[PDB]
Design a protein around this ligand. Structure first.
Ligand SMILES: *Cc1c(COP(=O)(O)O)cnc(C)c1O
Ligand SMILES: *Cc1c(COP(=O)(O)O)cnc(C)c1O
Lengths: 310, 310
């Protein structure tokens, strides 16, 4: 019998899909395919790390459902992944999240029974992180899995996300394109694949308004889920070939086209990754290369935002 | 390479998950497991029929993307499934839907680029169907796949949904419980499995406020996706062992517990199916029987409703 013990054993193992309209429309000479992290149980890539971080801490005896209050600052998806895990396992969970993130994210957290404290929009992720740190320092048995630092984040991507790409492309993937939030996705992919394919390229995507991976200064932007405003500790710049900066307008435009022209309803950051993959795929040296882009989230979580509202 | 041609080749093949808290809390003597139709690409069971109905009509030369205007009355999910398919394949699509269905459903349809005409809430599905029929009768090249009559609906459930249950339970499933909207799910399951397992039970679920399968009169109710207010042509009462009626309050209560106590964020109708499965699973004759319930939809589509709002 193939019956999962619980929802945490059903995360990852997401499929690849080719694009059929957008690349030809933009004159792309490479082959662009999409890894659909929208098909995780709670509809984002973060399900993978919600599970891995919690399992890692439990195994080391660092947390226990009967006493630990999990606390995590989030732009939404990590909070939702942990909220699902917490609901399955019986953990109390408190999220801090900036008020600028989509209304759907707030409602998702509450639906799973987690506690949410919103932090001021002007303070961005820094405000969320500071508040979470204050809660953890002060509260007995509070514990932060710390998604920007936790080795279980890049590890699960090395062991699952990257292996899936490797298998599903029969070892022929040439380039992976991924927006950076925590950096775990693109880092874990590069770590696993580069040893097997020396010419493989790992390309990071960030908002042009907050180009910190590129050496620039942090700023406000609308690409929810990427552009934390600092370089995460887990991110390994030495493994990444290049950083592509993306305007908010292009992220929104390409995410809309994903839904309407490909039937791939997608978050804003998937739009940013596609715009980037288009630019890379048009380079003459990349003709007939196989480019996999990561689609981090499903677009239903974004209907209230400027992506689709009106 | 395992790369899907497009999103329509990634529907179905959904997993089973055991329940870990709710059955013991209710003194259930059977084993209740859930088939997660929330994990289809657009997060409901309807993805399966959106694909099968369109492929069937295309193969027979009855529709073509360059000319057909698809038109379908819906409570939401069939419209969304067809909207995804339409976006991938380049069909124009018009949905009629009662204003009583969740706001998320409206926004989902528009996000995929479909056209929506809302019909009066007081008229329910009958109003939606009448308007769709008026559009089709009157409009050149308009075409309704007709989800309540289309043989491709129960067929795809016979060939995919039912085979998945058969395989995943190693042929040991004793009972399937499913709410009835079109009736295709529970009918196709019963058709495939009963010949292989004479003692197998197929049990239909309907709202107590609109118990038409039970021989009663139609009425208004809040279990979105089930209780059409008539017996669908595809539904085969001779294959169904029994109909269980469910109150709106119990559907809401059990859907909330699915999210918060199992980490299975679910639509309202999944709550109705669980309440039913609990009742069946408590019967002394069903001790140690394996009961699979269908979870028709993911709960993100329902955050604006009374299920979670406030
Ligand atoms: C997490 C996330 C990303 C980036 O993934 P990382 O592995 O954290 O870099 C992109 N988009 C969205 C919507 C996310 O939630
Ligand atoms: C379609 C649907 C059902 C019932 O499935 P059928 O195969 O149409 O009987 C139940 N719940 C929801 C939310 C649906 O969209």
């Amino acid at each position: 019998m193939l019956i999962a013990r619980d929802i945490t054993q059903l995360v990852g193992r997401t499929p690849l899909v080719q694009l059929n309209r957008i690349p030809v429309a933009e004159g792309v000479k490479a082959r662009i395919v999409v890894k659909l992290e929208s098909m995780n149980p709670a509809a984002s890539v973060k399900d993978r790390i919600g599970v891995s971080m919690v399992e890692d801490a439990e195994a080391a005896g660092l947390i226990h459902p009967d006493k630990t209050i999990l606390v995590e600052p989030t732009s939404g998806n990590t909070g939702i992944a942990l909220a699902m895990v917490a609901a399955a396992k019986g953990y109390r969970l408190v999220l801090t999240m900036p008020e600028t993130m989509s209304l759907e994210r707030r409602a998702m957290l509450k639906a799973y029974g987690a506690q949410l404290e919103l932090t001021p929009g002007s303070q961005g992720m820094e405000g969320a992180i500071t508040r979470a740190e204050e809660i953890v320092e002060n509260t007995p048995n509070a514990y932060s899995l710390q998604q920007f630092r936790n080795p279980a984040n890049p590890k699960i991507h090395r062991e699952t996300t990257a292996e899936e790409i490797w298998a599903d492309t029969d070892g022929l993937v040439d380039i992976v394109i991924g927006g950076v939030g925590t950096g775990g996705t693109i880092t874990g992919i590069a770590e696993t694949i580069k040893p097997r394919r020396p010419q493989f390229q790992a390309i990071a995507v960030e908002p042009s308004n907050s180009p910190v991976l590129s050496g620039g200064q942090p700023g406000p932007h609308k690409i929810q889920g990427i552009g934390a405003g600092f370089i995460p500790a887990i991110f390994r710049p030495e493994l990444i070939d290049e950083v592509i900066i993306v305007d908010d307008t292009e992220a929104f435009a390409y995410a809309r086209r994903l839904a309407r022209q490909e039937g791939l309803l997608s978050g804003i950051s998937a739009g940013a990754a596609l715009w980037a993959a288009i630019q890379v795929g048009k380079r003459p040296e990349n003709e007939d290369k196989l480019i996999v882009m990561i689609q981090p989230s499903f677009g239903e979580r974004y209907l209230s935002t400027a992506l689709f509202k009106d």
